From Swiss-Prot, chain A:
The protein's name: NADH-ubiquinone oxidoreductase chain 1
Transmembrane segments: 2-22, 68-88, 100-120, 147-167, 172-192, 213-233, 249-269, 290-310
Catalytic activity: a ubiquinone + NADH + 5 H(+)(in) = a ubiquinol + NAD(+) + 4 H(+)(out)
Signal peptide bounds: none
Main location: mitochondrion
Membrane-protein topology: Multi-pass membrane protein
Single annotated GO MF: NADH dehydrogenase (ubiquinone) activity
Family from the record: Belongs to the complex I subunit 1 family.
Subcellular location: Mitochondrion inner membrane
Swiss-Prot record, chain B:
EC number: 7.1.1.2
Database matches in Gene3D superfamilies: 1.10.287.3510
Keywords: Electron transport, Membrane, Mitochondrion, Mitochondrion inner membrane, NAD, Respiratory chain, Translocase, Transmembrane, Transmembrane helix, Transport, Ubiquinone
Function: Core subunit of the mitochondrial membrane respiratory chain NADH dehydrogenase (Complex I) which catalyzes electron transfer from NADH through the respiratory chain, using ubiquinone as an electron acceptor. Part of the enzyme membrane arm which is embedded in the lipid bilayer and involved in proton translocation.
Protein source organism: Ovis aries (Sheep)
Record-given protein name: NADH-ubiquinone oxidoreductase chain 4L
A GO MF term: NADH dehydrogenase (ubiquinone) activity
Family: Belongs to the complex I subunit 4L family.
From Swiss-Prot, chain D:
Keywords: Electron transport, Membrane, Mitochondrion, Mitochondrion inner membrane, NAD, Respiratory chain, Translocase, Transmembrane, Transmembrane helix, Transport, Ubiquinone
Organism per entry: Ovis aries
A Pfam entry, by short name: Oxidored_q3
GO biological process: mitochondrial electron transport, NADH to ubiquinone; mitochondrial respiratory chain complex I assembly
Reactions listed under catalytic activity: a ubiquinone + NADH + 5 H(+)(in) = a ubiquinol + NAD(+) + 4 H(+)(out)
EC number per UniProt: 7.1.1.2
Name this protein carries in UniProt: NADH-ubiquinone oxidoreductase chain 6
Keyword set includes Transmembrane helix: yes
Curated annotation (Swiss-Prot), chain I:
Any one annotated GO CC term: respiratory chain complex I
Function: Core subunit of the mitochondrial membrane respiratory chain NADH dehydrogenase (Complex I) which catalyzes electron transfer from NADH through the respiratory chain, using ubiquinone as an electron acceptor. Essential for the catalytic activity of complex I.
One matching Pfam family: Oxidored_q4
Family, similarity comment: Belongs to the complex I subunit 3 family.
InterPro entries assigned to the protein according to its UniProt record, in alphabetical order: NADH_UbQ/plastoQ_OxRdtase_su3, NDAH_ubi_oxred_su3_sf
Name listed for the protein in its UniProt record: NADH-ubiquinone oxidoreductase chain 3
One BP term from GO: mitochondrial electron transport, NADH to ubiquinone
Top EC group: translocase
GO MF term set: NADH dehydrogenase (ubiquinone) activity
Gene name linked to the record: MT-ND3
Lineage summary: Eukaryota, Metazoa, Chordata, Craniata, Vertebrata
Membrane topology of the entry: Multi-pass membrane protein
Length: 314, 98, 347, 169, 57, 105, 70, 96, 110, 80
């Protein structure tokens, strides 16, 4: 019965990632004064299916790899981590209810740079390796503000428990006491997933260009699973919905609408801005987000003490 | 005593003898050094969690942090060696025989 | 280096050694050694040449291995004793691992193989820190765990250090390697009397630090790193030849000098414990140390090697180097033997 | 068999060390140390060290081995018998250890080790409404003042040290 | 050393409180109010004797 | 040189993590709190040389609490004899050691 | 016009609605019509194992009330 | 809003902790009778198993002290089934 | 236990999709390809700056590891000491960032 | 002291906000009247069992029952 619950988690993940590609092409279409796909299916609803079947019978690109083993391991690690980030998510009840789910997600997202690094070294292109090193340095840079912002928010929660974060936000959204943390958090999640305006793997080579159409599609769907997941996590973390315990589907509808709007906000940010130069988002992290993040971490340490608003441990 | 301590001590001795028998790379030496640290972390952790000695639960984190700073310093030394010879080969570090 | 950064880093070296000296918890012992190593690495890379990076790499690897063996000894002590007090150890395996780790930190033979390399690779001031200040923290830990140290191990390390530091310095012409093999022999002398009377261990450490600080200060004041450049000192500064003469005759332990003071006291404590063969063989082995000291005094003070012509330019310039405590350290390292019963202040 | 599970993880742990101690290449050795860190984390987690295991992931693996693999990928330009012989030597010594301590329920390499499953050494009570390990790590700010001072000072000095030695001036 | 002294299985027979934890938690404040005295006699005896065998009755 | 700065100045830098029987957060006892308290109160002040031979019983009880070597040896002996008698068929386990007894509370 | 993107958003929103609805109905099916017992702390697990022992059917969620006493 | 609600949450935490406190004597009495039940069963089966063994004191304490020692996990569940062992020794750790 | 089942299911589905993506188009018989990069064959030049930003990550990640028990440490009864040491750790992370600034460590990847 | 402040707020508003929020976090808990209640609430939270005292006969401040008047109260927490 638990295996049914695991499958009803992870097969809808793959379906939502499949149709997120359609939603991105359509929304980026209408924001660019054109249409998106509307020929292949009715309203383009068969475009992800057609594209999956196209990519899974395309010729293998057949690279000469420096390592065969890490070239196999990098998509496996990417998909495994992108599927295990979902299991503590309280929506309203997590699959795995763990006491330290926030730190679990921070750890499993910190492990996601090995897929980039191993795929960059497993290619024989030196320029692909340079791009992989830039992508890893970007991701580990923004993980610093992820961890410190996330700590500063959970100083209002009381624990690392993700389900407690719903109880924390029953009277007000947590974006009201922590909107500067929310906006630096949101741009840091935008820079974690290598999402525009932080997508330098498409700014003028990607780390995974030596993969065939199948494995590059697996990297791509792990990336969009990370995108939907971080939007759900940001929704749980700052926009926590009403939860009637006798009617859990009210919370499920509410966090689903908010997470969809936040994923469309990712789609709407990539339809609006040019890219950063690489040093410019390094400047954005180290010289702008990190001093404010340390200052607000001092503020959110000292603030529950000075107002007598320390959250409970349990 | 307990059976898991046998494996964690044997892991420390395996990472010891790897760290005490260099092949060519200094990076492989640093990896053996950090394997020694990791086995120390695991062994300290299993003792302190077993004994329910509460105040030493902050002890392995400390054992992590310093030693990882140590690892950082080691990486920096390797890079300086790599910025002299192009490789981190330990046979290039032989100028101090005379 | 920025002088502020130099001051903060040297205060951090001193802070690490003081944290080793004052702490009652083994984790803070390990932390003091980690802080000491981490802060002394930039002192060794002060001039930024490949020999300093090689020396700092070798120093890092040996001290890191000793720190891991130290933490394993600590963790086995926590196994077999359930506590953390910096005192005797409660397992002979943890005692052996801690004695090995401290022998690696001191560079006692057969873990001596980094000491003449690293001291050669680094400047004279950082070599002075490595051969004087870096002994204090492991000798403090050996001072506090001596109810658990194996006698056979500590005396094996002692005699192997004295013999290898005797034979190693006989083949050298570089002054820093001479001071390094002198270091190995003197650490053998300090650990040979540790389980018998550790006050004499502290006495030997203090007299050794004074004499080594005098010789490194003379080498810094004359800017000499080789034997053959030290032999140009009589034509540049004739008083420095007298000072290196009396200090090298002191370091060999010739009476009536003060460097005769420790080893004699060490023999004075090893014959009370019915060991006659061991301090006799130690004293006969120290004649090798005295032999290459006499080689340096023949090169520098008692003869006059030929100089060059450009020396005549250096006659027109006095030494502007801050020869810090050099008359004080020269007087203390030579004329202190009539005050030998002052050693009771170390009890 | 499932009562021995931590022991089983520890076997894999030792196997993982014979992965990188034999030193095939620093990148495969990095991978072996990553797998070793994951299974040693599982060993930690199965005694109740949830926070310490997530420190193994976030700080050892996701923090430090990232920098090891990152620095390693900037060296050892991309494309043995001693490695293979060392690996089979370590594996056969470890399986002889397993065979002895399972056939005898006791072994002595240096110390005497029981051969029962390591579930037997646990406590039979509850800790109430707290993890004891979580409260002992929370005591770093209330009881660990000197430890916080010396650790934060060593990290600040470590920043200064890396910036001094990586400059070359 | 010595032989451990355990009470018999007859000394451990008692009519159990066979209710679930929500029954106990829902009645918990009135249980602490009403059953104060034998509970605190038991827990004083339990922290003073440091032995459950001495605290059975 | 053990320059005892902590006792001189009266500060407490690291004595708190030193033993298991010290003041713990939320009064959490160690599993060998009583044995370690008895060994420390035995061996206090009399010096290590007398403490090795005069407090051997408390220290052996405390070490056998810490590592449980005699206890696990006894469990080895009982389980091995039980498995031998099951192999010989001269013993049968009771229902409460087979899981058919409807547990106590 | 712009509402042409709403079928894909509807499909993706149903696909995000499925996991939480599924785990809520599976938790109510597996735990006697109620929520899954959250045992983050060892006291909660102690109460839960006590419920499993006092139920008599080796199921923690089968609750026994005042009818189980005299 | 977080001030008012976290103060309410602290009061609710104190109410839960006092429910726990009011229940702890009953749970402690049941726990004592539980562990003495299990030790008496282990002692009786040790008595009926360890008869052939020469020089075996049944129920011999491995401690020199006569003080009560908290019963270890393998002392209680040593003679029982593997499912009861795993449920008592990794049940809370593996619980989701 | 349910966590290990879920990890095994996620890893097995990932390995199955990777096996399908590496072996479903291998069944075709397309054509053999002879096929004889911005840098041609020049060895990868080392960047000091990427290593410095990775080490700065590592050191700030250790300082983060120290900062992680604060939502538990706020529950203590020695709150003045706890608040002082929390502000001191975040201040030492800020001093590390300031020294990384002022010695031009955050330059050309600012 | 005022031209420099407007200068740095014109050039570097991120850093002015950073140092200002950090200064408030430093100085404001010492000026707050509610810092005392944080301590009082953390000591009012009963993690452990209230191990009772043996009645020697002369303890007028220790109650015999939870509903007795003497003992520590939490009226301040319910009211605030
Ligand atoms: C107790 C342990 C003491 C350990 C030594 C402490 C000092 C040395 C460490 C720091 C250092 O290097 O300082 C420089 C150092 C001088 O070393 P130097 O630069 O190599 O000397 C060259 C000339 O002195 C340079 O001369 P100048 O032209 O620059 O100016 C003259 C200078 C001007 O002096 C001043 O200006 C001093 C007055 C101001 C001091 C600060 C006030 C604020 O006079 C002196 O310094 C005279 C030298 C006095 C002797 C130094 C050593 C003191 C005794 C150490 C212990 C000996 C124990 C023997 C036991 C034997 C038996 C076991 O000390 C001083 O300058 C001040 C000395 C004060 C001594 C006080 C002793 C009692 C303390 C209680
Ligand atoms: C979670 C739900 C959503 C959250 C909100 C986010 C929605 C909006 C997103 C819009 C699209 C953004 C795309 C990427 C943008 C990247 C560029 C960018 O913005 O860079 C950040 C820019 C960078 O600025 P810059 O780089 O342009 O500025 C120049 C800087 N120098 C001089 C160094 C070159 O700003 C920041 O870094 C600010 C981050 C947020 C700060 C929040 C401060 C709150 C107020 C604090 C108090 C202030 C008063 C003082 C104290 C008073 C006390 C009483
Ligand atoms: C769940 C995500 C999507 C899943 C994957 C997509 C679903 C459909 C998968 C099967 C599609 C049909 C087989 C692959 C496509 C073959 C294309 C092709 O060029 O075939 C020619 C190839 C080769 O034919 P050929 O001999 O003419 O070769 C052409 C090349 N020359 C002449 C130069 C040598 O056909 C095959 O390999 C046949 C494969 C098996 C046929 C189908 C079996 C049943 C499948 C169910
Ligand atoms: C720079 C360091 C500045 C802060 C120093 C510590 C401030 C503080 O709150 O200390 C109280 C804390 C704790 O004191 P306390 O008053 O909380 O103690 C009550 C007792 N316990 C801990 C059991 C609740 O530390 C000390 O008193 C001793 C440790 C620090 C001693 C000074 C070290 C200086 C190092 C300089 C180099
Ligand atoms: C959680 C919800 C998830 C939902 C995911 C799916 C979203 C999109 C749903 C489908 C949208 C409509 C699909 C219509 C497909 C095209 C049908 C069609 O007209 O096909 C015509 C083609 C040729 O027809 P022919 O007879 O030759 O025409 C001449 C007539 N004189 O005939 C053919 O091509 C043959 C018939 C092909 C039919 C394909 C149907 C679509 C497959 C969809 C798969 C997913 C279904 C839903 C799964 C989840 C719910 C169970
Ligand atoms: C035993 C018998 C079966 C043997 C094995 C076959 C299995 C079933 C395969 C699907 C059905 C077979 C027929 C496939 C389509 C054939 C008809 C066709 O091509 O119709 C064309 C029609 C659109 O007309 P078009 O030519 O595009 O005109 C442009 C508009 N002016 O096209 C349409 O209207 C839409 C056609 C959609 C095709 C079907 C839907 C996609 C496939 C779904 C199942 C497989 C993938 C599942 C999900 C994968 C992961 C996302
Ligand atoms: C290259 C190799 C292959 C790469 C792809 C696959 C690996 C990478 C992706 C998967 C990562 C696995 C992570 C496993 C541990 C995660 C941490 C964890 O267990 O946290 C959850 C929870 C802690 O929370 P808490 O509620 O306190 O505990 C339960 C108490 N009621 O604790 C629990 O719930 C405890 C549950 C029991 C213990 C679980 C032990 C898991 C098995 C060992 C580690 C497996 C991974 C090894 C390899 C790592 C990556 C190389
Ligand atoms: C007695 C103490 C040692 C016991 C274990 C011995 C394991 C087998 C290795 C024996 C030596 C083989 C050898 O040649 O080692 C040298 C090699 C480094 O030298 P390299 O440059 O790679 O090759 C030139 C060949 N000498 O060195 C290595 O590669 C050694 C790596 C050792 C890693 C330890 C792995 C576990 C070994 C078993 C448990 C201990
Ligand atoms: C039980 C005992 C407990 C502990 C008691 C105390 C032990 C003290 C141990 C002393 C160790 C001294 C270590 C070396 C000094 C440290 C500072 C330093 O680095 O000084 C050298 C400094 C560098 O200047 P720089 O410009 O780099 O010189 C090279 C040329 N350009 O400047 C120079 O180069 C200037 C040249 C002269 C420097 C002389 C320094 C002598 C210091 C030692 C004095 C003797 C020991 C104290 C008295 C006995 C105590 C036991
Ligand atoms: C006391 C409370 C705790 C304080 C410590 C904790 C702070 C939390 C935030 C952490 C910040 C870490 C990094 C700080 C680095 C500061 C140095 C610096 O950045 O100097 C360079 C900068 C000019 O920038 P530049 O070098 O040109 O770089 C290119 C961008 N233009 O130069 C400048 O921009 C000048 C910066 C200094 C002036 C800032 C003034 C702000 C005043 C706010 C009101 C007072 C608040 C109370 C605190 C006292 C502040 C002095
Ligand atoms: C298990 C496989 C499920 C289906 C595959 C993922 C869903 C389809 C995505 C198709 C796709 C789109 C639209 C796409 O635009 C794109 O280019 C950026 C891809 O990467 C190569 C894609 O993979």
């Amino acid at each position: 019965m638990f295996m049914i619950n695991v499958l009803t988690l992870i097969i809808p993940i793959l379906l939502a990632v499949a149709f997120l590609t359609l939603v991105e092409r359509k929304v980026l279409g209408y924001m660019q004064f054109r249409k998106g796909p509307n020929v292949v299916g009715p309203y383009g609803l068969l475009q992800p299916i057609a594209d999956a079947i196209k990519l899974f019978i395309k010729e293998p690109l057949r690279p000469a790899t420096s390592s065969i083993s890490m070239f196999i391991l990098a998509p496996i690690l990417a998909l495994t981590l992108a599927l295990t980030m979902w299991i503590p998510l309280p929506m309203p009840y997590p699959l795995i209810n763990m006491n330290l789910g926030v730190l679990f997600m921070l750890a499993m997202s910190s492990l996601a740079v090995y897929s980039i690094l191993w795929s960059g070294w497993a290619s024989n292109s030196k320029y692909a390796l340079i791009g992989a090193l830039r992508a890893v340095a970007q991701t580990i840079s923004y993980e610093v503000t992820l961890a410190i912002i996330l700590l500063s928010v959970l100083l209002m929660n009381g624990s690392f428990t993700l389900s407690t974060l719903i109880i924390t936000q029953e009277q007000v959204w947590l974006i009201f006491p922590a909107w500067p943390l929310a906006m630096m958090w949101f741009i840091s999640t935008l820079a974690e997933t290598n999402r525009a305006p932080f997508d330098l793997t498409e700014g003028e080579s990607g780390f995974n260009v030596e993969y065939a159409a199948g494995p590059f599609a697996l990297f791509f769907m792990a990336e969009y699973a990370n995108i939907i997941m971080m939007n759900i996590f940001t929704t749980t973390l700052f926009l926590g919905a009403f939860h009637n315990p006798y009617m859990p589907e009210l919370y499920t509808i509410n966090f689903t609408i908010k997470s969809l709007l936040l994923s469309i906000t990712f789609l709407w940010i990539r339809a609006s801005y040019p890219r950063f130069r690489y040093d410019q988002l390094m400047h954005l992290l180290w010289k702008n987000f990190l001093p404010l993040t340390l200052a607000l971490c001092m503020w959110h340490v000292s603030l529950p003490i000075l107002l007598s608003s320390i959250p409970p441990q349990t | 005593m307990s059976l898991v301590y046998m494996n964690i001590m044997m892991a420390f001795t395996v990472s010891l003898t790897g760290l005490l028998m260099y092949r060519s790379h200094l990076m492989s030496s640093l990896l053996c050094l950090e394997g020694m640290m990791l086995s120390l972390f695991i062994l300290a952790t299993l003792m302190i969690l077993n004994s329910h000695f509460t105040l030493a639960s902050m002890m392995p984190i400390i054992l992590l942090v310093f030693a990882a700073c140590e690892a950082a310093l080691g990486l920096s030394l390797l890079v300086m060696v790599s910025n002299t010879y192009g490789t981190d080969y330990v046979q290039n570090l032989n100028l101090l025989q005379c | 280096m920025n002088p502020i950064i130099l001051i903060i880093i040297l205060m951090t070296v001193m802070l690490g050694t003081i944290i080793v000296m004052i702490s009652t918890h083994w984790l803070l012992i390990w932390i003091g050694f980690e802080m000491n190593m981490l802060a002394i690495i930039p002192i060794m890379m002060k001039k930024h040449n490949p020999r300093a990076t090689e020396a700092s790499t070798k120093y890092f690897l040996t001290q890191s291995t000793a720190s891991m063996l130290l933490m394993m000894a600590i963790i086995i002590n926590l196994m077999f004793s359930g506590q953390w007090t910096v005192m005797k150890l409660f397992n002979p395996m943890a005692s052996m691992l801690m004695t090995m780790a401290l022998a690696m930190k001191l560079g006692m033979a057969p873990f001596h193989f980094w000491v003449p390399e690293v001291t050669q690779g680094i400047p004279l001031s950082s070599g002075l820190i490595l051969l004087t200040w870096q002994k204090l923290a492991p000798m403090s830990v050996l001072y506090q765990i001596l109810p658990s140290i194996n006698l056979d191990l500590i005396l094996t390390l002692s005699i192997l250090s004295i013999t290898i530091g005797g034979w190693g310095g006989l083949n050298q012409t570089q002054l820093r390697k001479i001071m390094a093999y002198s270091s190995i022999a003197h650490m053998g002398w300090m650990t040979a009397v540790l389980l018998y009377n550790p006050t004499m261990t502290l006495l030997n450490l203090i007299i050794y630090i004074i004499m080594t600080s005098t010789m490194f200060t003379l080498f810094m004041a004359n800017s000499t790193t080789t034997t053959l450049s030290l032999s140009h000192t009589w034509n540049k500064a004739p008083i420095m030849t007298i000072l290196v003469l009396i200090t090298l005759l002191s370091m060999g332990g010739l009476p009536p000098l003060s460097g005769f003071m420790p080893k004699w006291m060490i023999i004075q404590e090893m014959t009370k414990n019915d060991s006659i063969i061991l301090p006799t063989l130690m004293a006969i082995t120290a004649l090798l140390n005295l032999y290459f000291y006499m080689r340096l005094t023949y090169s520098t003070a008692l003869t006059m090697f030929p100089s060059t012509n450009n020396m005549k330019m250096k006659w027109q310039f006095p030494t502007t180097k801050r020869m810090t405590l050099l008359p004080t350290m020269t007087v203390l390292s030579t004329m202190l033997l009539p005050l030998t019963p002052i050693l009771s202040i170390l009890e | 068999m499932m009562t021995y599970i931590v022991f089983i993880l520890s076997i894999i742990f030792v196997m993982g060390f014979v992965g990188f101690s034999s030193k095939p290449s620093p990148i495969y050795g990095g991978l072996g140390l990553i797998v070793s860190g994951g299974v040693g984390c599982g060993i930690v987690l199965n005694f109740g060290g949830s926070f310490l295991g997530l420190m193994v992931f976030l700080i050892y693996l996701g923090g430090m081995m990232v920098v090891f693999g990152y620095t390693t990928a900037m060296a050892t330009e991309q494309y043995n018998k001693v490695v293979l012989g060392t690996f089979i030597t370590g594996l056969l010594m470890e399986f002889l250890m397993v065979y002895y301590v399972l056939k005898d329920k006791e072994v002595e390499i240096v110390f005497k080790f029981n051969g029962m499953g390591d579930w037997v050494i646990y406590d039979t009570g509850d800790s109430g409404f707290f993890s004891e390990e979580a409260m002992g790590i929370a005591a770093l700010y209330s009881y660990g003042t000197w430890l916080v001072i010396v650790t934060g000072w060593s990290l600040l000095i470590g920043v200064v040290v890396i910036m001094e030695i990586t400059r070359g001036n | 050393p010595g032989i451990v002294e355990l009470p018999s299985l007859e000394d451990l027979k008692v009519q159990e409180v066979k209710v679930s934890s929500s029954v106990l938690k829902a009645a918990a404040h009135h249980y602490g109010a009403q059953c104060d005295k034998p509970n605190k006699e038991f827990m004083l005896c339990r922290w003073e004797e440091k032995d459950p065998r001495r605290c059975l009755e | 040189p053990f320059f005892d700065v902590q006792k001189k100045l009266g500060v407490d830098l690291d004595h708190w993590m030193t033993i298991q029987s010290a003041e713990q957060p939320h009064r959490i006892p160690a599993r060998c709190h009583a044995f370690e308290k008895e060994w420390i109160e035995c061996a206090h002040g009399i010096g290590s040389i007398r403490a090795e031979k005069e407090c051997k019983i408390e220290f052996e009880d405390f070490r056998e609490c810490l590592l449980r070597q005699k206890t696990m040896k006894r469990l080895n002996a009982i389980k091995r004899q039980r498995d031998k008698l099951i192999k010989e068929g001269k013993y049968t386990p009771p229902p409460h050691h087979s899981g058919q007894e409807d547990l106590r509370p | 016009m712009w509402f042409e993107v709403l079928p894909g958003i509807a499909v993706m929103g149903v696909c995000l609605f499925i996991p939480g609805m599924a785990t809520a109905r599976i938790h109510r099916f597996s735990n006697g019509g109620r929520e899954k017992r959250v045992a983050h702390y060892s006291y909660q697990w102690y109460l839960m194992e006590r419920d499993r022992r006092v139920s008599g059917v080796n199921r923690y969620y089968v609750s026994k009330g005042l009818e189980n006493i005299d | 809003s977080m001030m008012r609600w976290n103060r309410e949450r602290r009061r609710l935490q104190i109410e839960d902790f006092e429910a726990r406190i009011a229940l702890m004597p009953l749970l402690q009495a049941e726990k004592d009778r539980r562990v003495l039940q299990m030790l008496r069963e282990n002692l009786e089966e040790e008595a009926t198993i360890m008869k052939d063994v020469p020089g075996w004191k049944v129920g011999e304490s491995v401690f020199h002290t006569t003080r009560w020692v908290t019963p270890m996990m393998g002392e209680l569940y040593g003679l029982r089934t593997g499912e009861e062992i795993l449920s008592s020794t990794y049940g809370f750790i593996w619980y989701t | 236990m349910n966590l290990m089942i879920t990890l095994l299911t996620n890893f097995t589905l990932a390995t199955l999709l990777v096996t399908i993506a590496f072996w479903l188009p291998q069944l075709n018989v397309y054509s053999e390809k002879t096929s004889p990069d911005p840098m041609g064959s020049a060895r990868l030049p080392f960047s000091m700056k990427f290593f410095l930003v990775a080490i700065t990550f590592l050191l700030f990640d250790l300082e983060i590891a120290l900062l992680l028990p604060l939502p538990w440490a706020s529950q203590t009864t020695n709150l003045n000491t706890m608040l002082t040491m929390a502000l001191l750790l975040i201040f030492l992370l800020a001093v590390s960032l300031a020294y990384e600034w002022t010695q031009k460590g955050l330059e050309w990847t600012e | 002291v005022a031209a420099f402040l407007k200068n740095v707020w014109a050039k570097e508003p991120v850093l002015v906000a950073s140092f200002a929020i950090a200064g408030l976090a430093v100085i404001l808990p010492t000026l707050s009247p509610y810092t005392k209640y944080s301590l009082m609430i953390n000591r009012a939270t009963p993690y452990n069992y209230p191990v009772p005292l043996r009645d020697d006969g002369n303890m007028p401040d220790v109650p015999s029952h939870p509903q007795d008047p003497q003992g520590p109260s939490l009226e301040w927490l319910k009211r605030l």
